[PDB]
Amino acid sequence: SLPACPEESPLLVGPMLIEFNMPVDLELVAKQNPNVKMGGRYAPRDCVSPHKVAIIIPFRNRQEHLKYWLYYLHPVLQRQQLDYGIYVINQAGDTIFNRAKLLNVGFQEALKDYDYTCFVFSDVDLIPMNDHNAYRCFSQPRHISVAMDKFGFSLPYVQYFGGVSALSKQQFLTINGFPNNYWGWGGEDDDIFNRLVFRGMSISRPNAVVGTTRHIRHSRDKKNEPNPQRFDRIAHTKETMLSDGLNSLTYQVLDVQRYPLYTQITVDIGTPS
Numbered sequence: 410s411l412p413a414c415p416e417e418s419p420l421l422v423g424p425m426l427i428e429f430n431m432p433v434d435l436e437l438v439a440k441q442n443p444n445v446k447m448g449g450r451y452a453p454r455d456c457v458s459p460h461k462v463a464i465i466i467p468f469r470n471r472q473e474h475l476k477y478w479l480y481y482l483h484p485v486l487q488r489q490q491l492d493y494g495i496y497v498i499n500q501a502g503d504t505i506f507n508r509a510k511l512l513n514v515g516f517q518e519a520l521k522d523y524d525y526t527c528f529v530f531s532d533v534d535l536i537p538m539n540d541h542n543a544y545r546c547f548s549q550p551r552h553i554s555v556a557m558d559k560f561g562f563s564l565p566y567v568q569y570f571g572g573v574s575a576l577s578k579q580q581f582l583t584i585n586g587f588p589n590n591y592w593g594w595g596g597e598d599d600d601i602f603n604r605l606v607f608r609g610m611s612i613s614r615p616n617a618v619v620g621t622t623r624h625i626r627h628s629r630d631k632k633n634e635p636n637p638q639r640f641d642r643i644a645h646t647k648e649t650m651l652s653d654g655l656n657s658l659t660y661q662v663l664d665v666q667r668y669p670l671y672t673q674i675t676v677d678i679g680t681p682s
């Protein structure tokens with residue numbers, strides 16, 4: 410009986426003030442967001458959203474950043490009238506980090522909860538400054554964090570696709586998901602850009618003002634050192650994407666926690682093979 414939500418949300422306020430100098434209390438955030446259900450799930454009560462979005466955050470030892478992320482994003486996602494869920498994919502252990510593999514885990518596991526048809530992949534330390542920057546999918550892969558303060562409010566290079574992006578379920582499946590072998594920092598986002606291009610797609614982006622994004626300044630994490638093989642790997646994406654991705658993925662979930670503001674999947678994704 411509920412009608413469809415309007416194509417563009419009438420609730421948006423646009424430019425917002427973002428700051429990271431204050432403490433955040435998630436119990437309070439939960440109180441400020443009474444309509445967000447257990448596990449960090451929300452859908453509008455007055456209309457049906459065509460956007461069924463699973464937001465996937467690759468993660469390890471970034472609780473402080475995550476608190477700010479939840480504090481700022483939950484209000485924004487609800488104003489965008491999305492039927493969404495938050496998933497923090499926590500890498501078990503203390504061996505070399507694997508951002509893209511965790512993102513694949515997020516895609517596969519979120520699908521076990523609900524019929525999501527859109528996936529937003531977001532680093533934990535990126536906060537949008539304008540709610541007109543849609544956290545949902547488009548006819549083409551969508552690059553969301555286009556004008557980050559750390560890059561001088563512009564793209565670092567025109568083919569940059571890192572930070573925050575959204576791929577529909579079909580777009581993601583079409584590229585066999587993300588690569589599983591980019592251990593350590595760098596290149597996996599360039600590999601993903603290549604995958605999309607090699608499958609006939611092009612990147613969709615909001616304008617630079619609407620796409621303004623803040624990065625929470627932080628120091629280098631241990632166990633995610635720049636991958637020396639990254640330059641060689643992105644040069645062979647066309648060939649490697651055929652057999653490295655969703656169709657070559659295995660992992661072992663160790664724990665699933667449903668917190669009020671998000672679902673945390675702690676997973677063992679192993680080490681290089």
Ligand SMILES: CC(=O)N[C@H]1[C@H](O[C@H]2[C@H](O)[C@H](O)[C@@H](O[C@@H]3[C@H](O)[C@H](O)O[C@H](CO)[C@H]3O)O[C@@H]2CO)O[C@H](CO)[C@@H](O)[C@@H]1O
Pocket residue numbers: 565566571572594595596597598599639640643
């Ligand atoms: C493959 C890779 O590392 N991609 C990351 C991307 O890398 C940029 C880098 O930020 C900068 O734009 C430039 O850096 C040169 C590169 O490291 C080369 O090998 O050595 C010279 C020595 O002077 C560097 O200046 O080009 C890289 C390749 O496009 O940066 C983005 C944003 O941080 C990462 O998301 C991406 O993974």
Ligand SMILES: NCCCCCCOP(=O)(O)OP(=O)(O)OC[C@H]1O[C@@H](n2ccc(=O)[nH]c2=O)[C@H](O)[C@@H]1O
Pocket residue numbers: 466467468469470471506508531532533534535594627628629630631633
């Ligand atoms: N001068 C200090 C510059 C710090 C350089 C470190 C590289 O920074 P960035 O390119 O922002 O990458 P990053 O934030 O370390 O990694 C991207 C994303 O991986 C996740 N991530 C990475 C490493 C880690 O230990 N834990 C974690 O959760 C997190 O969602 C993060 O936002």
Ligand SMILES: [Mn+2]
Pocket residue numbers: 532534624627
């Ligand atoms: Mn960062």
